[PDB]
User: Which sequence fits this backbone?
DNA sequence: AGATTGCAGCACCTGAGTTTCGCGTATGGTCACCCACTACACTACTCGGTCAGGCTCTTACCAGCTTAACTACAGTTGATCGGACG
């Protein structure tokens, strides 16, 4: 049901991998504030290459835009509903 | 019409053809980092010219004389020059 409510599909058939789904859960927790890709990377505990390669699987669910943070160039992520 | 026997029907364990799958193994693709090369504008030390300072060499002497040449006066002859010719 959590899978279905967030992705629109059940765990039994959804195309999103477990790691990418946990990324989505972090964006779900942050809601209206959303998460920048580096704080997401730090909180999930994985590197920016891995985060970027995974985020492709969910870019249709997320509104995004560029921003500059701690001298690095990053994007903000928000679920469409927020 | 009974003692001997086969048909074949019931049920349950089993087997392969067929399928879906997981992984190896390996291949094209994302993207993040940091490197090499280039270059417009700059930093800064030296060399170089110019100037003064002031120590330095070398001159040539005054009138006279006494060792040395010129420096004017002077006369018939050049050959460019004017200006007109062909």
Assistant:
């Amino acid at each position: 049901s959590l899978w279905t409510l967030l992705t629109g599909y059940t765990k039994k058939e959804s195309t999103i991998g477990n790691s990418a789904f946990e990324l989505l859960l972090e964006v779900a927790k942050s809601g209206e504030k959303g998460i920048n890709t580096m704080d997401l990377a730090q909180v999930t505990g994985q590197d920016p290459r891995s985060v970027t390669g995974r985020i492709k699987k969910i870019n249709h669910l997320l509104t995004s835009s560029q921003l500059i943070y701690k001298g690095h160039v990053v994007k903000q992520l928000k679920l469409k509903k927020f």
